[PDB]
Amino acid sequence: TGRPEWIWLALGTALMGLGTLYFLVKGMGVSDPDAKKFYAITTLVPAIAFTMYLSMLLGYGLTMVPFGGEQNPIYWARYADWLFTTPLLLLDLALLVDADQGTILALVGADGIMIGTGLVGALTKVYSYRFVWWAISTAAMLYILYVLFFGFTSKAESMRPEVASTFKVLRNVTVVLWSAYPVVWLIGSEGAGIVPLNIETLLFMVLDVSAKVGFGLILLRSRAIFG
Amino acid sequence: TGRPEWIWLALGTALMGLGTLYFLVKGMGVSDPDAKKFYAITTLVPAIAFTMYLSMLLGYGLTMVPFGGEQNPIYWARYADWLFTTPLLLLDLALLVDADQGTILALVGADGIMIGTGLVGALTKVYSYRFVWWAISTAAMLYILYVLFFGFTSKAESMRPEVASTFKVLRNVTVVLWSAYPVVWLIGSEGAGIVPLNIETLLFMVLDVSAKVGFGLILLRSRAIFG
Amino acid sequence: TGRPEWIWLALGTALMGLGTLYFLVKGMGVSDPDAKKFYAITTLVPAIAFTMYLSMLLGYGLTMVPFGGEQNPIYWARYADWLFTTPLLLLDLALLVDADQGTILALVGADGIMIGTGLVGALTKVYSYRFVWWAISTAAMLYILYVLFFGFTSKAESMRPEVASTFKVLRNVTVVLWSAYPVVWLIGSEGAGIVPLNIETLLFMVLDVSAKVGFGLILLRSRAIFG
Ligand SMILES: CC(C)CCC[C@@H](C)CCC[C@@H](C)CCC[C@@H](C)CCOC[C@@H](CO[C@@H]1O[C@H](CO)[C@@H](O)[C@H](O)[C@H]1O[C@H]1O[C@H](CO[C@@H]2O[C@H](CO)[C@H](O)[C@H](O)[C@H]2O)[C@@H](O)[C@H](O)[C@@H]1O)OCC[C@H](C)CCC[C@H](C)CCC[C@H](C)CCCC(C)C
Ligand SMILES: CC(C)CCC[C@@H](C)CCC[C@@H](C)CCC[C@@H](C)CCOC[C@@H](CO[C@@H]1O[C@H](CO)[C@@H](O)[C@H](O)[C@H]1O[C@H]1O[C@H](CO[C@@H]2O[C@H](CO)[C@H](O)[C@H](O)[C@H]2O)[C@@H](O)[C@H](O)[C@@H]1O)OCC[C@H](C)CCC[C@H](C)CCC[C@H](C)CCCC(C)C
Ligand SMILES: CC(C)CCC[C@@H](C)CCC[C@@H](C)CCC[C@@H](C)CCOC[C@@H](CO[C@@H]1O[C@H](CO)[C@@H](O)[C@H](O)[C@H]1O[C@H]1O[C@H](CO[C@@H]2O[C@H](CO)[C@H](O)[C@H](O)[C@H]2O)[C@@H](O)[C@H](O)[C@@H]1O)OCC[C@H](C)CCC[C@H](C)CCC[C@H](C)CCCC(C)C
Ligand SMILES: CC(C)CCC[C@@H](C)CCC[C@@H](C)CCC[C@@H](C)CCOC[C@@H](COP(=O)([O-])OC[C@H](O)COP(=O)([O-])O)OCC[C@H](C)CCC[C@H](C)CCC[C@H](C)CCCC(C)C
Ligand SMILES: CC(C)CCC[C@@H](C)CCC[C@@H](C)CCC[C@@H](C)CCOC[C@@H](COP(=O)([O-])OC[C@H](O)COP(=O)([O-])O)OCC[C@H](C)CCC[C@H](C)CCC[C@H](C)CCCC(C)C
Ligand SMILES: *C\C=C(C)/C=C/C=C(C)/C=C/C1=C(C)CCCC1(C)C
Ligand SMILES: *C\C=C(C)/C=C/C=C(C)/C=C/C1=C(C)CCCC1(C)C
Ligand SMILES: *C\C=C(C)/C=C/C=C(C)/C=C/C1=C(C)CCCC1(C)C
Numbered sequence: 001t002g003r004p005e006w007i008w009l010a011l012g013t014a015l016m017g018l019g020t021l022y023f024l025v026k027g028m029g030v031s032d033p034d035a036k037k038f039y040a041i042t043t044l045v046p047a048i049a050f051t052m053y054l055s056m057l058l059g060y061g062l063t064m065v066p067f068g069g070e071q072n073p074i075y076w077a078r079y080a081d082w083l084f085t086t087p088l089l090l091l092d093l094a095l096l097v098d099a100d101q102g103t104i105l106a107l108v109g110a111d112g113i114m115i116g117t118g119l120v121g122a123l124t125k126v127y128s129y130r131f132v133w134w135a136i137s138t139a140a141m142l143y144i145l146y147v148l149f150f151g152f153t154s155k156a157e158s159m160r161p162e163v164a165s166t167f168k169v170l171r172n173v174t175v176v177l178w179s180a181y182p183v184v185w186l187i188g189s190e191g192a193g194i195v196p197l198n199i200e201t202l203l204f205m206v207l208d209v210s211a212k213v214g215f216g217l218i219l220l221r222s223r224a225i226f227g
Numbered sequence: 228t229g230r231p232e233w234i235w236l237a238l239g240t241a242l243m244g245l246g247t248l249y250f251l252v253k254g255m256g257v258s259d260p261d262a263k264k265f266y267a268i269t270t271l272v273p274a275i276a277f278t279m280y281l282s283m284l285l286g287y288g289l290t291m292v293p294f295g296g297e298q299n300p301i302y303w304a305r306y307a308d309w310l311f312t313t314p315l316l317l318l319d320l321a322l323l324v325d326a327d328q329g330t331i332l333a334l335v336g337a338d339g340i341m342i343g344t345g346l347v348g349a350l351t352k353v354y355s356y357r358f359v360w361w362a363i364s365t366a367a368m369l370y371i372l373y374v375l376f377f378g379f380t381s382k383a384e385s386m387r388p389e390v391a392s393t394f395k396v397l398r399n400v401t402v403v404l405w406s407a408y409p410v411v412w413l414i415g416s417e418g419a420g421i422v423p424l425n426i427e428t429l430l431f432m433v434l435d436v437s438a439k440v441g442f443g444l445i446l447l448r449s450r451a452i453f454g
Numbered sequence: 455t456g457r458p459e460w461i462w463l464a465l466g467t468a469l470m471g472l473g474t475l476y477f478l479v480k481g482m483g484v485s486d487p488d489a490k491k492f493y494a495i496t497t498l499v500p501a502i503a504f505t506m507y508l509s510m511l512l513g514y515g516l517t518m519v520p521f522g523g524e525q526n527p528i529y530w531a532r533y534a535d536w537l538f539t540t541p542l543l544l545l546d547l548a549l550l551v552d553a554d555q556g557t558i559l560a561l562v563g564a565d566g567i568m569i570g571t572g573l574v575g576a577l578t579k580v581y582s583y584r585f586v587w588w589a590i591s592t593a594a595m596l597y598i599l600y601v602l603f604f605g606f607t608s609k610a611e612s613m614r615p616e617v618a619s620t621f622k623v624l625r626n627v628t629v630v631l632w633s634a635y636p637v638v639w640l641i642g643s644e645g646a647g648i649v650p651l652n653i654e655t656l657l658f659m660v661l662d663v664s665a666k667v668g669f670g671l672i673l674l675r676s677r678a679i680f681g
Contacts, residue, residue, distance in 0.1 A: 036556035044563040051567060051590065055574060058583050084566075102263035109271040112311075113278060120282060129285050136278065329490035336498040339538075340505060347509060356512050363505065 001073045002062045005201035012205045013053040019046035019213040023220060034095075038225040041092050042216045045085045049212055052081035067127045073189060073197055078204065079119035086111045089174065089215060093148060096167055096224060097155040107144060114140040122190045130191060138182045145175050166224035170215060177211045228300045229289045232428035239432045240280040246273035246440040250447060261322075265452040268319050269443045272312045276439055279308035294354045300416060300424055305431065306346035313338045316401065316442060320375060323394055323451060324382040334371060341367040349417045357418060365409045372402050393451035397442060404438045455527045456516045459655035466659045467507040473500035473667040477674060488549075492679040495546050496670045499539045503666055506535035521581045527643060527651055532658065533573035540565045543628065543669060547602060550621055550678060551609040561598060568594040576644045584645060592636045599629050620678035624669060631665045 002009075020043060027039030055061035061077025087108045094104045114137050121133030148171060156167040184207070185191055188200035195203075219225065229236075247270060254266030282288035288304025314335045321331045341364050348360030375398060383394040411434070412418055415427035422430075446452065456463075474497060481493030509515035515531025541562045548558045568591050575587030602625060610621040638661070639645055642654035649657075673679065 033554050033556065036554055037559065038556075040556040040560035040563070044560065047563070047567060051571060051574075054586075054590075058578070058580070058586075060574060060578055060583075100260050100263055102260065102265075102267040105264065106267035106271065109267070109274070113274060117278060120278075120287060124285070124287055126285070129287075132281075132285075136281075327487050327490055329487065329492075329494040332491065333494035333498065336494070336501070340501060344505060347505075347514060351512070351514055353512070356514075359508075359512075363508075 001197075002056070002059055002075075004196075004198045006057065008198075008201040008205045009053060009057040012208060013050060013057050015205075015209045015213060016046045016050035016053050019209070019216065020050055023216055026220065032226050034227045035225045037095060038092065039220065041088050041095070042220055045088050045212045046216060048085050048088075049081055049208060052077045053208075055080075065123055065125065067125050067130065068193075074122050075201075076119065076122065079115050079122065082118075083112065083115045085212065086115060089212070090144070090148075092215075092219060093152060093167070093170060093174070096163060096170070096219075097152045097159065099152065099155055103147065103151065107147060110140050110144050113137075114144065118185065122185075134182065134186060134191065141178060141182060145178060149175055162222065163224045166219065166222040169218055173215060173218065174211065177207055180207055228424075229283070229286055229302075231423075231425045233284065235425075235428040235432045236280060236284040239435060240277060240284050242432075242436045242440060243273045243277035243280050246436070246443065247277055250443055253447065259453050261454045262452045264322060265319065266447065268315050268322070269447055272315050272439045273443060275312050275315075276308055276435060279304045280435075282307075292350055292352065294352050294357065295420075301349050302428075303346065303349065306342050306349065309345075310339065310342045312439065313342060316439070317371070317375075319442075319446060320379060320394070320397060320401070323390060323397070323446075324379045324386065326379065326382055330374065330378065334374060337367050337371050340364075341371065345412065349412075361409065361413060361418065368405060368409060372405060376402055389449065390451045393446065393449040396445055400442060400445065401438065404434055407434055455651075456510070456513055456529075458650075458652045460511065462652075462655040462659045463507060463511040466662060467504060467511050469659075469663045469667060470500045470504035470507050473663070473670065474504055477670055480674065486680050488681045489679045491549060492546065493674065495542050495549070496674055499542050499666045500670060502539050502542075503535055503662060506531045507662075509534075519577055519579065521579050521584065522647075528576050529655075530573065530576065533569050533576065536572075537566065537569045539666065540569060543666070544598070544602075546669075546673060547606060547621070547624060547628070550617060550624070550673075551606045551613065553606065553609055557601065557605065561601060564594050564598050567591075568598065572639065576639075588636065588640060588645065595632060595636060599632060603629055616676065617678045620673065620676040623672055627669060627672065628665065631661055634661055 023039065023043040023046060027036070027043065030036055030039060052061060055077045056075050061075050061080070063074050063076050065072045065074045090107050090111055091104070093099075094107065099107075117133050117137035117140060121130045121137060124130050124133060152167065153171060156164045156171075159167075181204075184195075184200060184203050187194040188203075189195075189197045250266065250270040250273060254263070254270065257263055257266060279288060282304045283302050288302050288307070290301050290303050292299045292301045317334050317338055318331070320326075321334065326334075344360050344364035344367060348357045348364060351357050351360060379394065380398060383391045383398075386394075408431075411422075411427060411430050414421040415430075416422075416424045477493065477497040477500060481490070481497065484490055484493060506515060509531045510529050515529050515534070517528050517530050519526045519528045544561050544565055545558070547553075548561065553561075571587050571591035571594060575584045575591060578584050578587060606621065607625060610618045610625075613621075635658075638649075638654060638657050641648040642657075643649075643651045
């Protein structure tokens, strides 16, 4: 349940919070209309993360699901968070690399399903079924990382070296990080309880802050966001 | 409840699933940026349909509402599905016919209300009230079919004959199909139980697959989607 | 609970309803593509307000939350309403003043959090915690009114006098009205029950109709919406 992992939630809330502050206090006097978009998209990611992390800390984002012949502590707020933050991150990559509206739409769709599926899985009562939803969700995820890796990289090659390189870093960071989530989910309390909610929460915490604050940092501190 | 209609759900899940596969395996090597958009929008429709049909089959999308002095089997997942798939379909028509942003916005709004209202109706406990929500939802629907029929057709007349004709087919197919839903809802378990959930599910199944896979087929196999 | 304030809900439902009708019956024969957008955005605001007000009147939008060592009557539908209507209103201001996509995105984000936070607050069981969420929600709100007041006004100064002035009126009306909500929430049943749900409902009613129908009226009856 929620108590031993109260601390990881606390640190997460705080890190996202400061992350918002730092990104907010930096894009204040930014004239560049394109850079303006990047700060907006990027800043909104940690801000949302902050509200959802606070709901877990205060006990709201946590619920109980019966499965495995018992009651289970499921932090649902993660899906509420990700549902918006993942597309926003994706949007950042698309703008940076000037992707086609079609692909953005396809990418956003894939993402919504990825989280939608993950959320449903996290709540389904037939233990067994939770793993099907996981399968679907991961399939959706993989599609995204594919397009990002082979599709987006290609589009980056046409931009100026600054953008190509920043994208390369961002690309590597999201591909590697995003794929850890399904592994954590799988071995955590949402799936086979191989790992305690204690460590799991510390894991999502590190992954989230990296995948958002870190990503924001890499992106917002490069000249790539400028026209 | 969910058992006698388990089969229609199963076939639906499967048909949507293959529908996604087929549309996915066809727009792979498509350079045309406009055609790319059409495949994205269209492909996402059956994909969502698949996840929601699977939730009904696995028992998740089903809930119980007390009304009529008794418990009632309400597949809520349909609204979760439609909420996204109906606008997407609408968006397809708008792109094809190059509609004004204003009308798209108005059309999307109408749709969200149409489903939002339908969902609320499906869940309201005062039997009587379910019919008011139905009224509102249908009113919203009618507005949409109106704009599609008289507004969009007009905009199609300015496109090349290929587009005008494909739109005509699509227009006829959506106008006729969409209007069956409110009739099914009305006579099914959501309203006056004149028809059993058994047949009702077989009905939504046929309507959905036609309105999505069929629509996708008609659209994605014409040269209308190209610039 | 829901009974003594049944009337304010009834009048609200009716006022929004007519508000939709009036805005609908006025933008019918409007060729101007820009004006078309304004009518669409603006008309959808009261229309949504109508469906949510009807849910409160019919008893659906009302729920019960335990806090303060007792059961509490919480009209949740307000958040469902606002979640969409507030951005739409914001979008109106942005179009009118031709704001940057970045700022619109930032503004929409802030708003979603503002309502999301408000909703969570309205539902949190630890009385005490409801006030933190209020704090966050208001902080988000303030950010919005700031950008609207100092940012948007600046952008209005570049438009023709008609637009600058209409915006000025709209700006003053939203800044003043929006800031009353957090005060009402604070002193109403969602926070410290200093004011009865009776008067509270009459308050939100006046604020809503003004902030939407009034706003719509001021905007839709000026030549500012034309190109
Ligand atoms: C952009 C649009 C305008 C989009 C729409 C966005 C929105 C709708 C997304 C929602 C997304 C999904 C993923 C989240 C929902 C998950 C869902 C399955 C879980 C829902 O449950 C929580 C919900 C309601 O809370 C509850 O109220 C009901 C009514 O009164 C009750 O019937 C429920 O039981 C109650 O649940 C709570 O309490 C439970 C407590 O039980 C226990 O009690 C015992 C008593 O002895 C003891 O105390 C135990 O300890 C205790 O646990 C608990 O178990 C439950 O979990 C629950 O807490 O909550 C509503 C959440 C709200 C929707 C979150 C919003 C997220 C943030 C703010 C979003 C910011 C987004 C903006 C929009 C982004 C903008 C950028 C774009 C432009 C890209
Ligand atoms: C784009 C944005 C980023 C937009 C936001 C999208 C999202 C928020 C939309 C939601 C839309 C609405 C329409 C769906 C919600 C309907 C709502 C009224 C119904 C909610 O209930 C289900 C919800 C939660 O499940 C539950 O968990 C709670 C917390 O722990 C519990 O308190 C509930 O009770 C529990 O409910 C389940 O179980 C019930 C079981 O009871 C019974 O138990 C007995 C025991 O003996 C026995 O077993 C009985 O047989 C059994 O029934 C059951 O009755 C309930 O129905 C329920 O199953 O679920 C969350 C669903 C999730 C939000 C669905 C998402 C849909 C898909 C994946 C969307 C893909 C969308 C992308 C975004 C599209 C992209 C394209 C655009 C760009 C255009
Ligand atoms: C654009 C996208 C495509 C975006 C997605 C939009 C959508 C998902 C947004 C949702 C936003 C949030 C803010 C609203 C949800 C708030 C949430 C916390 C509250 C949820 O509860 C209500 C929910 C389900 O109702 C219930 O069914 C469950 C399953 O069967 C049950 O388990 C619940 O208990 C049940 O709750 C009801 O009944 C309770 C009754 O208890 C009591 O019973 C006793 C008996 O003796 C006695 O009778 C008592 O008097 C009685 O009270 C009650 O307490 C509960 O409150 C509840 O009524 O409802 C689903 C609502 C639906 C999602 C509202 C939609 C809003 C409108 C139509 C939106 C129009 C939007 C379009 C999209 C805008 C377009 C423009 C853009 C382009 C900008
Ligand atoms: C049981 C199952 C049936 C159910 C599945 C579960 C499912 C719900 C989850 C999957 C997610 C799914 C929702 C995703 C939908 C995607 C769909 C909307 C995509 C539509 O398609 C949009 C395109 C975007 O195109 P581009 O990449 O940008 O190409 C640019 C080119 O260089 C030209 O540029 P120019 O114009 O300037 O000249 O997708 C990108 C094109 C790519 C370059 C090519 C991609 C190929 C695919 C990866 C392979 C096809 C899929 C496989 C046969 C199997 C399906 C697996 C599933 C996991 C995807
Ligand atoms: C109790 C009730 C009060 C509550 C009602 C319930 C309600 C919640 C459900 C209804 C759905 C509602 C939410 C829909 C909102 C719609 C609103 C946003 C629309 C705003 O309006 C946007 C326009 C889009 O314009 P266009 O069609 O594209 O015109 C192009 C022209 O050719 C010029 O081209 P050029 O620029 O190139 O020169 O709507 C299209 C303009 C059309 C051509 C004309 C349409 C006329 C209407 C159908 C008639 C007006 C309505 C009726 C008086 C009664 C209301 C019934 C209700 C069912 C709509
Ligand atoms: C907080 C920021 C980000 C980038 C979060 C990303 C989360 C994911 C990519 C989650 C993926 C999931 C999969 C693939 C399947 C199991 C369920 C998850 C939702 C955890
Ligand atoms: C799955 C694909 C589509 C095109 C589904 C369309 C569904 C509708 C048009 C439903 C309309 C409804 C009305 C008009 C009123 C009763 C409730 C419904 C939601 C069933
Ligand atoms: C119906 C139309 C509008 C413009 C409604 C606006 C509502 C708000 C600005 C609400 C703000 C809130 C704050 C700042 C904090 C407490 C909770 C609220 C959601 C009431």
